[PDB]
Amino acid sequence: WRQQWSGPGTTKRFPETVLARCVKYTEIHPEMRHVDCQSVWDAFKGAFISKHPCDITEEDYQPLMKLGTQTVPCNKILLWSRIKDLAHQFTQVQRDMFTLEDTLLGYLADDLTWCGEFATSKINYQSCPDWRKDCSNNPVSVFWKTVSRRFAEAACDVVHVMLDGSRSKIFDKDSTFGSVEVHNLQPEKVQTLEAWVIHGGREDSRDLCQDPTIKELESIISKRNIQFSCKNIYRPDKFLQCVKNPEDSSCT
Numbered sequence: 001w002r003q004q005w006s007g008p009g010t011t012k013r014f015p016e017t018v019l020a021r022c023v024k025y026t027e028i029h030p031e032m033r034h035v036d037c038q039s040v041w042d043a044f045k046g047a048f049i050s051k052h053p054c055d056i057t058e059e060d061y062q063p064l065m066k067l068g069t070q071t072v073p074c075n076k077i078l079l080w081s082r083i084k085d086l087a088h089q090f091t092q093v094q095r096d097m098f099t100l101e102d103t104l105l106g107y108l109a110d111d112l113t114w115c116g117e118f119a120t121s122k123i124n125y126q127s128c129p130d131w132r133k134d135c136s137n138n139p140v141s142v143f144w145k146t147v148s149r150r151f152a153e154a155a156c157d158v159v160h161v162m163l164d165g166s167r168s169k170i171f172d173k174d175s176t177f178g179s180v181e182v183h184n185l186q187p188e189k190v191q192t193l194e195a196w197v198i199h200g201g202r203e204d205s206r207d208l209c210q211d212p213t214i215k216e217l218e219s220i221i222s223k224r225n226i227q228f229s230c231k232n233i234y235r236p237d238k239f240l241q242c243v244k245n246p247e248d249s250s251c252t
Contacts, residue, residue, distance in 0.1 A: 005053070007130035007138075010114040010123050018044060021108050032070060032104055040067050040108070047139070052118035053128060054135035056142040065146065068105040072098050074156035074189065081177035083164040083198055086236055090162070093243045100151045109147075115139045145180055152181040156189035163214075165232075166200030171213040173220075182220055192227035199234045208232055 011017065022037035043063040048056055076097045080087035087099045100106040115128035115138060129138035161177065163170050172178055185193060195217065197208040208214065209230035221228040233239050242251040 005127040005129045006133040007128050008113055009125040009127045011112045014114050018108050025104050025107050043067050049116040050121050051116055053115040053138050056137050056139050058146045061143055061146045070103050072103060074154055077155045077159050079177060079181050080162040081175050083162050086198060087162045089240055093240060100148060105147050109143060113140055148176050148180050149184050152184035155185055157191050159190055160194050162196050165197040165208040169213050170197055170211050171217040185226055187225040190226050192229055193221050194229035196231050196233050198236050205234055
């Protein structure tokens with residue numbers, strides 16, 4: 001019965017964008033110089049083409065994961081949930097820290113959508129499955145689920161997570177962070193998780209670290225035998241300014 005999927009189609013020039021980004025990334029990060037970008041693309045494409053976009057599994061991405069393996073300083077990880085723009089501006093200033101999208105694999109896929117068809121070897125630019133309305137095991141959702149697991153799993157010592165304090169659920173156990181990332185923080189490596197609850201402005205300067213969802217996060221982490229810490233960030237704009245110029249009079 002299905003005629004179309006409910007989500008946007010594969011990004012236009014998805015093949016050129018993925019190949020190009022891999023080239024640009026490996027040039028900026030000399031350490032990844034050994035990466036054969038055409039091979040990366042082939043592995044990526046091989047993961048979903050000619051396959052029904054609702055039966056993708058993590059194994060499908062295994063070859064891409066292998067080729068894109070990258071070692072990231074485990075005490076320099078910044079996880080984030082529903083506040084990507086600030087997390088990315090933060091790492092652009094605090095360059096020694098990484099978000100998933102600062103790794104080769106995450107950079108390749110960020111902001112892109114893709115899927116194939118099981119009946120052909122063509123990329124579907126018309127539409128792609130929507131995680132909620134169509135099926136959860138689509139090419140895009142399985143990729144992020146797979147690479148998010150690996151990223152959190154590599155974290156050690158003090159791991160930080162940025163959260164949007166203006167949402168009804170600052171911490172949402174049903175997000176990728178609450179389902180995939182938090183449960184993959186290994187206590188043998190991770191000492192403590194520190195959440196930075198970002199304020200939006202509409203809300204008063206209340207202590208969002210007391211929020212019920214944050215107490216939920218704290219319990220979750222406590223049971224993982226990992227310490228939990230939470231900090232309010234009343235002024236996200238001033239915050240970035242101070243990361244850039246730490247010794248400025250406007251800083252707290």
